[PDB]
Amino acid sequence: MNMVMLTIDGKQVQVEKGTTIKKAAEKLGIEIPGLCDDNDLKPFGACRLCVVEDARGNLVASCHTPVREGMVVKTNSPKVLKARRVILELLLSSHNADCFECDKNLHCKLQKYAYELNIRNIRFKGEKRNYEIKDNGPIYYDPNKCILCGKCVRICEEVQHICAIDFASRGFKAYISTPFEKPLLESDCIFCGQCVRVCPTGALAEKTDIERIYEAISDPNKVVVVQVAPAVRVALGEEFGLEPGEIVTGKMVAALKRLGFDKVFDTQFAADMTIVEETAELVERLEKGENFPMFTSCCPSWILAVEKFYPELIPNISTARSPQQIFGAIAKNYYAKKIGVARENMFVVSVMPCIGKKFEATRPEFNNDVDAVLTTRELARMIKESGIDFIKLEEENFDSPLGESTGAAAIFGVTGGVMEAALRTAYSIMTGEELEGDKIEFTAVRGLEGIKEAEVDIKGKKVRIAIANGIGNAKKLIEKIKSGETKYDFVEVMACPGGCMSGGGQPYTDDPEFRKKRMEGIYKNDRNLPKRKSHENEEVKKVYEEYYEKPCGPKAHEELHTHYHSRKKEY
Amino acid sequence: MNMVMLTIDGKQVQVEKGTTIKKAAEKLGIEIPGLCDDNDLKPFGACRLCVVEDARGNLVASCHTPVREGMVVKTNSPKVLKARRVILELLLSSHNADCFECDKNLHCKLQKYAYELNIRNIRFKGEKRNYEIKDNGPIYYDPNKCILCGKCVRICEEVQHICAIDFASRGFKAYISTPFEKPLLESDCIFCGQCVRVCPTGALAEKTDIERIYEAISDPNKVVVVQVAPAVRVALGEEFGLEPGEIVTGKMVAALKRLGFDKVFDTQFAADMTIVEETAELVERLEKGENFPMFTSCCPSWILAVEKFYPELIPNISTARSPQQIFGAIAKNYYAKKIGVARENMFVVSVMPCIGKKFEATRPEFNNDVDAVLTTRELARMIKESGIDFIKLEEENFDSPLGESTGAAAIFGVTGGVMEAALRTAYSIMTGEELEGDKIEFTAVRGLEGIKEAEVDIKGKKVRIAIANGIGNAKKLIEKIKSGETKYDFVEVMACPGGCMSGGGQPYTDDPEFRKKRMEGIYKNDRNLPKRKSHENEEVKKVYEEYYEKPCGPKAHEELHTHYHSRKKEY
Ligand code: SF4
Ligand code: SF4
Ligand code: SF4
Ligand code: SF4
Ligand code: SF4
Ligand code: SF4
Ligand code: SF4
Ligand code: SF4
Numbered sequence A, B: 001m002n003m004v005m006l007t008i009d010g011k012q013v014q015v016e017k018g019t020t021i022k023k024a025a026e027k028l029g030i031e032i033p034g035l036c037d038d039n040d041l042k043p044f045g046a047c048r049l050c051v052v053e054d055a056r057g058n059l060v061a062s063c064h065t066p067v068r069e070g071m072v073v074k075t076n077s078p079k080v081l082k083a084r085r086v087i088l089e090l091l092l093s094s095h096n097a098d099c100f101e102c103d104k105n106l107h108c109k110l111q112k113y114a115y116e117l118n119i120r121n122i123r124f125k126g127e128k129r130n131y132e133i134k135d136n137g138p139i140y141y142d143p144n145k146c147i148l149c150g151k152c153v154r155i156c157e158e159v160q161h162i163c164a165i166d167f168a169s170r171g172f173k174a175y176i177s178t179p180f181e182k183p184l185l186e187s188d189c190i191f192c193g194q195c196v197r198v199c200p201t202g203a204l205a206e207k208t209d210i211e212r213i214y215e216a217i218s219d220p221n222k223v224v225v226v227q228v229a230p231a232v233r234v235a236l237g238e239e240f241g242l243e244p245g246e247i248v249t250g251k252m253v254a255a256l257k258r259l260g261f262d263k264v265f266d267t268q269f270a271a272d273m274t275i276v277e278e279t280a281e282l283v284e285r286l287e288k289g290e291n292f293p294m295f296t297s298c299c300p301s302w303i304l305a306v307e308k309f310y311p312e313l314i315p316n317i318s319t320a321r322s323p324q325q326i327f328g329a330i331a332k333n334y335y336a337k338k339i340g341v342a343r344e345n346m347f348v349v350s351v352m353p354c355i356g357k358k359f360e361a362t363r364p365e366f367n368n369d370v371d372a373v374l375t376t377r378e379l380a381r382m383i384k385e386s387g388i389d390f391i392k393l394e395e396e397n398f399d400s401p402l403g404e405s406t407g408a409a410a411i412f413g414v415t416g417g418v419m420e421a422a423l424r425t426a427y428s429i430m431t432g433e434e435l436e437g438d439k440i441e442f443t444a445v446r447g448l449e450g451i452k453e454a455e456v457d458i459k460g461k462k463v464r465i466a467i468a469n470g471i472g473n474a475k476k477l478i479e480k481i482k483s484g485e486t487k488y489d490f491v492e493v494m495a496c497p498g499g500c501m502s503g504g505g506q507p508y509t510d511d512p513e514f515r516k517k518r519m520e521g522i523y524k525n526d527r528n529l530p531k532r533k534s535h536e537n538e539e540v541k542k543v544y545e546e547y548y549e550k551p552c553g554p555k556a557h558e559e560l561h562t563h564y565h566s567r568k569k570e571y
């Protein structure tokens, strides 16, 4: 091993060779500001705001200069501060200053740096950016506030391997867009929502359906039922000053009950129903031994990717609905006749951490089962708007008769958790017995690796299980499968890297290790529940024996399944 | 005690009769927004943003509504939210939106309420407020961001009884002004800074001089000494997310060392200098028995209030300088000859929590001993500017030979702690012995009462002592003295209510009970020290025996004394 000695602010530093000055100065109790840098991306050097001076007398960037042995650098010299002040004055000279009306208010990094570097009087006044905004679906793009940091194109090209947007024009009028300024829906985008999560300004944000929620609640002839996702309860607490990984289920239930919503349920019931349907389909397919491999259809971004780029995989993907639409069908068809409320007077609201769900809700194939879709940020805005203090609430429980949950549906917010639930139910449906002890947990499908392969043995029969997180890794698996190197049986894809815990709806964070904390939170949540199996739930059995009488029945085929059509129109 | 039964948002409430419907709902884990209300002021009802809905169906204000038996109210009805949204749109329609240049950025309450209530598109665009910025000294007034809440007028009317500013004009063009738009120096202001502390916008701020500090640092031939106030050690941590009242001495010393300052010192040394000099003066005045009562000179605002309103008490004021100017004279007179530097080439910077110090630094009669002054908020902004992480610093001590101190000089940030620091020294100098055990602490001069009185018996000799915090209580006690009811010996006055811990330079807080926490922090800091007596300090005695040889000497009269001249201009 090779170690490197250097001096920073007159202090001796030992660092491993090859790390940058920004990374090497983390343990020294100092932080260099920068806008174009992220922990998941390569250095770009477009902000030029992270400059520090070496011994010679010139300023160099600190995010892409490797540490060489025997240099002295300074961080609080007056020249560096002057350069940073002038650079932020230049940035702020052409920014439309409607900070009252910005969705990214109180979380914008540019605003924090404008406060932090003591800017009080901008001498450069003149031409401002003046473009026209247009709708794009669930993604609201305002090119008046862009600073051309390049994070969105880098996260859409280097990680996602999709290349949906890129730079355009030259000079002062350069701007990031699609080909020929077309809307994102008919472009090559798949609505993963990663570009929204990394934008340091308010250029990229979410279309809001807040007014429709308030008009629906204000109407005295409409009954409102609201569902929450499994992955919201672990990261909702970041807005209110708590560390990530805290379980706030009861507090959020109390907040939802006090917000005016008539009924509060959870997706975990529909999640268990989806698991039952998927494992029935898997058992049937394995008995016939046809259409290998079989893909899961629980991620709207994945199904958009299949419909847009790979139309040949349409026969091989499952026909099961998303859990959101499953709960919508249950609420509009079975619960409504039980309570005695007309279908035209029922409102269903969902809280999900994804952005693909916002587009998925308005697909004409689903007959408008879900009316409006929220995100975690919108729910956190409701709580502050209504004045509810989140810290000192009293925890309550979910309503009846479909609020009770199991431990199999509590790990959908982690990559491969659907696979653990599928193996948990498949072991019981094949072997006939129930796993007890450490055999309940499948540790072979846990972690944060890009590709997760497993050879699962059930009563002497071995099956192949493949998990891919990230669209690029899914493309790699597609290339390997079409190459015919090996054959799998049951393959999961989630477009967001790391699972739904890192979707576009989750609150913004600065810690570089939020994924590990959220995984620990979800797993500790799952370990704190008496029931760990999907089929052991009673209410799912009551719903089946009350209305459908059989999984994968003709009524279930009518309501619990859908068909996909290829969107890859030829040129 | 008579209790009242009611319901608020469907929850039963038990509260005493007489509380409003906003202050009696804070203990239900719910809080309704408001801008015109503060815990130290009578309700005024100018925001009209704290409205709720009663049973009848008309919107009623909450900050001035007494509660009676039998009301049902709701604070989350759609009508109330719509009214609040429209009212905030009306406010932000006429606000100059340069939130990058605003000194109150990331702490403005209007910004936070614009974020909370989900404002996205201002429909009412029209004529804005267009006034002209004028200079006033240490108070920077910008009547373009004023929302006419009236907090400054009420706090200069109800508490201070100074009557410096008042409303002017009518209609849309009304504003806050002095008579005839004269500068605040020539008006009846006394520069207490309370109006700065309560302003919920960026209208009233500080004239910030970080720039001059920066070319002072960048000059290679100038040597910089920075001094810190006793009341800063208990309030800086609130700027970094800590609980108020945490002792952060070592952390702020490390931060000041890393900021480029050549030498760092505490002003407790000069404070003990002032204590021993004032004790000598008090012993002298007791021996002659003339010019009673005698007033302290530790507060510049008190001196201004005397020079403007009560010019007949000038012969009765102590001639001792403030500790800041005494430390400046020591640094520019004794320390400079010891190190071997020219007097013009020494730069003295102070970090004090008061606002009147900014004006006091530039008096022509002090011969420009100090060059620039700061407050705690600017110190925190500099710390965050250089990138220093305050949480993970290492404790380090002061410099030499003016770094160490005693416990008598650490309680200046409390109403009463100055005379409590002088009674021990007077006891020691007149009796000849030193207090032991719990007799060091005097429990009769601690608390938060408006006027504190005590009769202290020392060796059979009784002295009458009085404390007045707040200029209103000072005026009351001056009226009592001029009435001739009782005779005093030694009177302390601090202009800000609650002592120097509630100055204008301290960080903004929303907790209603910050004064108790700050007092507890100060007392814990005092009790965590080995030496508790000003006389037992070593370097004070060394300085006298090397340069003065006697307190109240001709050299001390030349350098540690000043004279006051009346400012009451005849009309
Ligand atoms: S949503 Fe995903 S695919 Fe679409 S532009 Fe953003 S990063 Fe690229
Ligand atoms: S759109 Fe957002 S992420 Fe992309 S360059 Fe502009 S500011 Fe950066
Ligand atoms: S992007 Fe940031 S600085 Fe720009 S308007 Fe929005 S909040 Fe203000
Ligand atoms: S992984 Fe989850 S958050 Fe990401 S696109 Fe798929 S469903 Fe949405
Ligand atoms: S007072 Fe508040 S809202 Fe107005 S410009 Fe300053 S920070 Fe923005
Ligand atoms: S500084 Fe004090 S006296 Fe002067 S206007 Fe403000 S509150 Fe009134
Ligand atoms: S100057 Fe500040 S405190 Fe005074 S009325 Fe205007 S906004 Fe209110
Ligand atoms: S009491 Fe302290 S903070 Fe207030 S004006 Fe006097 S010296 Fe300044």
Ligand code: FES
Residues within 6 Å of the ligand: A034, A035, A036, A037, A044, A045, A046, A047, A048, A049, A050, A061, A062, A063, A064
């Ligand atoms: S973000 Fe580091 S050089 Fe631009």
Ligand code: FES
Residues within 6 Å of the ligand: B034, B035, B036, B037, B044, B045, B046, B047, B048, B049, B050, B061, B062, B063, B064
């Ligand atoms: S601000 Fe409370 S009633 Fe006006």
